[PDB]
Design a protein around this nucleic acid. Sequence first.
RNA 1: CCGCAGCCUGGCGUUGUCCCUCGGGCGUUUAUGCGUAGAGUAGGUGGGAGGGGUCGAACCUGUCCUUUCGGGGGCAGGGGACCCGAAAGUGAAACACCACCCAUGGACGCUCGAGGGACUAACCUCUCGAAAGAGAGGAACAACGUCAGGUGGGCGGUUCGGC
RNA 2: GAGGUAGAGUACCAUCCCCUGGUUUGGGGGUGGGAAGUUAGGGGACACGUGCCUCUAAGGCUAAAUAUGUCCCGAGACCGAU
RNA 3: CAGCCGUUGACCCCGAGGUCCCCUAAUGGGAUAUCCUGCCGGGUUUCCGGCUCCCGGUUUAUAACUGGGUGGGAACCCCCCGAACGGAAACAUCUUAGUAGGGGGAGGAAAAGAAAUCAAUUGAGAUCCCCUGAGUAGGGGCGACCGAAAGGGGGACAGCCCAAACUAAACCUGCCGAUGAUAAGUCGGUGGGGAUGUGGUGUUACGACCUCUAGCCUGAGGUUGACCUCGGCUUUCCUA
Lengths: 169, 123
Amino acid sequence: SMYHYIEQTWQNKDWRRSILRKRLIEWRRQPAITRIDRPTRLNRARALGYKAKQGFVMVRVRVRRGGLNKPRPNSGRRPKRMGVYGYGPSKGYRWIAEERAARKFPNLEVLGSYYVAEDGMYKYYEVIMVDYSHPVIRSDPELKWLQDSVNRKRVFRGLTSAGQKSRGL
Amino acid sequence: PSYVKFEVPQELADKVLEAVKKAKDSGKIKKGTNETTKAVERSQAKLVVIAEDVQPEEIVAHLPLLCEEKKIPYVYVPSKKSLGEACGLQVAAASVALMDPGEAKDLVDEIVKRVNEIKGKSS
RNA sequence: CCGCAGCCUGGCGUUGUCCCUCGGGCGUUUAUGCGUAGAGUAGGUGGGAGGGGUCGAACCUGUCCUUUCGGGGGCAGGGGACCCGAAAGUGAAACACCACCCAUGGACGCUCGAGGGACUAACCUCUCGAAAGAGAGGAACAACGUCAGGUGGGCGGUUCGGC
RNA sequence: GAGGUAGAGUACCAUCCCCUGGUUUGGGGGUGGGAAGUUAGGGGACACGUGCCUCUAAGGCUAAAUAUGUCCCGAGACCGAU
RNA sequence: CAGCCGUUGACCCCGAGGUCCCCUAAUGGGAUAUCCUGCCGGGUUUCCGGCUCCCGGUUUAUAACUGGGUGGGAACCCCCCGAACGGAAACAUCUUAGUAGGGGGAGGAAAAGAAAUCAAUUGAGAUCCCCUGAGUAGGGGCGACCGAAAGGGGGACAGCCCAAACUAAACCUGCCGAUGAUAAGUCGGUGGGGAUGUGGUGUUACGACCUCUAGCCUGAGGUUGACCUCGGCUUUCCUA
């Protein structure tokens, strides 16, 4: 399939990593949460459940890498509980990126994510989101589970793929 | 872009689009990049037509190298919407493969000669 | 008694293009050597008293480099051909030839580093622009993330024996 | 009988921090490196080798068995105007 | 005190309707004013409708217009951030305790859930809860203290669906008309999607699935014992 060859050009250590560097220069200027027209990696999107119907949207999110933005305590602590450096959010940056996308698009449900790039200050992810109220999605037989109100806003309760991994499941 | 290997003069491009229209009516063609690569893998294609405004570039960036090793000629076309129109579609197409030219056997043979000499001067 | 921030410094990442120099190594390339007793430069382990000799030698005369100017190492001609000992001294001898070592310097192809210089397109700063984008200056440093060492009553927890 | 397919910054490694009974062996996160891909991968209490045994990560969904009590019915070796 | 309603069946109870002031998520704009004040459309005294972040469309392009999350709930539930008092007869690792608390998100239950699992001479077979295993293995200034799982007995006890190989528009959906019980569906006309892949097949391990070749196996029909086409089964949609 052509999807097998998409993953080969974007694989590991390649001349393609000269093309991808040029994109990053543009991506650093666009807003931190943007809707994009088409997935950058169709192999990753189609495996996670993206289709070419209307109601599927693609969002790119950039976050800031590093550890937790943790302040030094100001009241009295034992020496164990006074340390700052080395802490990272037990939630992954992949799960943090999905959460910020679900804030800006409150009518869509997160289906998956994968990252696309990385530089010295940010990490970039792309999130697959679907509109559960469009009549095209409402009639789909493979997403009939998405008509249950318990299956909405799952990203906030750790029920996505990135959340299951981080819960030790 | 970057997957465009050699320049194609505009007068040759219109010949390619004419070949696609003739081949569709009489012979067989493959529309789309999923059907085109599978024809190149099986060594069944006779001419592979590639658009020049594909975004992202990764969709068709493997075709020039894949058919280089299978000994299959390939040519470029500026607009994918025009390429989709030629093969009788309501949407665009990024790649087409001619299974058998049919009524356009002579026209295809003319194109291959023109392309082969352009690559000879491109080193 | 201890911790933790902040600060200083180094590694890794973001981080790229051209050089030059130096120091290591790998397979090669080569030519250079005086504790004393003595024909005299024994630096050491061996084959080796034969090795060179129209299969061209010892010898006078100079150009030249060098050294504890001690003295040896290389130059063609004049010479058409000679010297070391198996013999005399040395806790360890043969400039009798050939090998390796200690040890000087340079060069080939490869690797690793370390330093210095330049450049602009990342990054940063400013200006214009509603935005899109354009211009100027710096620049692979700064800045940021992460790890490591130092400093650190700035701040936090505590201990401050007994009779 | 012959051929084709099987989920990537993912598995894993070093280091730092928090959890854990997890201890030279478990889980999650930050930083750096980073696969194989069916002639493949994972596991079987330090590490590796050889047999043997067992499974298929990195894409979702899924009744019943249970947790609660604002509320409605019933009950009681409950209290009885400090 | 005074008057009235009810045998033309009231009051009262149950079911279905009507009216339903202002603030309030508060939502046209403003409120340290529970009060003020607009711009479009409709009839027309009153009055009644429309007026952040997204999605799918219209129309000339940043103008305008059609159709579609926010707050509450006594406790219970899911996810991140996260102490000290106290005990150790002092106290700092430790414990207290991932507790108290903070932030975000639901439901009548949530969450988990169909092995890259366990254990041991080749066995069991998704998840959850109860009685146990057991204060055992094991962690610890090896101090105070902390602490499983497999297995056994029970309660309930289901299993699918995608990406990929093979096909390649055979596809989905808004509005209008007919038919259909105003449903699903079928037919016709218009718009938006879709080759950067819609629909079909198909998802498991000493092997599964797919393609080709060869050979054997319900009914009717055609063709050259062999081939193909319509009648059972599986999955899904629907409501008078």
